[PDB]
Amino acid sequence: VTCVSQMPVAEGKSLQQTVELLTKKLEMLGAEKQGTFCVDCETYHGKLMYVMHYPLSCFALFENGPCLIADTNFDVLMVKLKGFFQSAKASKIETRGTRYQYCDFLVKVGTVTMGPSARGISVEVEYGDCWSLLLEFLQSFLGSHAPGAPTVFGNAVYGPADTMIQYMELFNKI
């Protein structure tokens, strides 16, 4: 279902220009503006915050997606433990970007936050496995990439909103 994101393998020019070329290729494929989203990140010495689609925020050091409430429910907990668990170091980079839809799918590319950051892309699926066919789409998008590495052998099944943990892997690339 929720396919994992991928690092921006394409790196031959300006990151902004690279994202622009990727979006131009996507438009050449043929899509429509489905809005713009973001992916936040806040580390606390290591609970890593997150936000995606979208009326719900998430934060987890190592858990199977314990988030089912809005940021307010979580931000209040953080503010309450201002000296107990508040270990907010230098603000972790957070990406953003528009999202388009070729056909019956969704695409989303990321952006840099401080400037020397990545601009990776993320895609998902609509089935419940089936990692083979979804790769073909990316074959039409770029060259060899997207190793995936999902939580295989679980279907704790279908990885519902657990892909944010995979998003943490993208945060590891720094």
Does 72 participate in binding other proteins (rule CB under 8 A)? Answer: yes
Does 36 participate in binding other proteins (rule CB under 8 A)? Answer: no
Does 128 participate in binding other proteins (rule CB under 8 A)? Answer: no
Does 67 participate in binding other proteins (rule CB under 8 A)? Answer: yes
What's the Cα-to-Cα distance from 167 to each of 51, 62, 95, rounded to whole Å? 10, 12, 11
> Which of 16, 36 has the CB closer to other proteins?
36
Phi and psi of 100, rounded to 5°?
Answer: -120, 175
Does 66 participate in binding other proteins (rule CB under 8 A)? Answer: yes
Among 17, 36, 70, 174, binds other proteins (CB under 8 A): 70
Among 28, 32, 55, 147, binds other proteins (CB under 8 A): 55
5 and 106 in contact (C-beta within 8 Å)?
no
Amino acid at residue number 52: M
| Cβ at position 74, least distance to other proteins in Å | 7
What residue ranges bind other proteins (CB under 8 A)? 35, 52-56, 60-70, 72-74, 76-77, 80, 84, 160-161
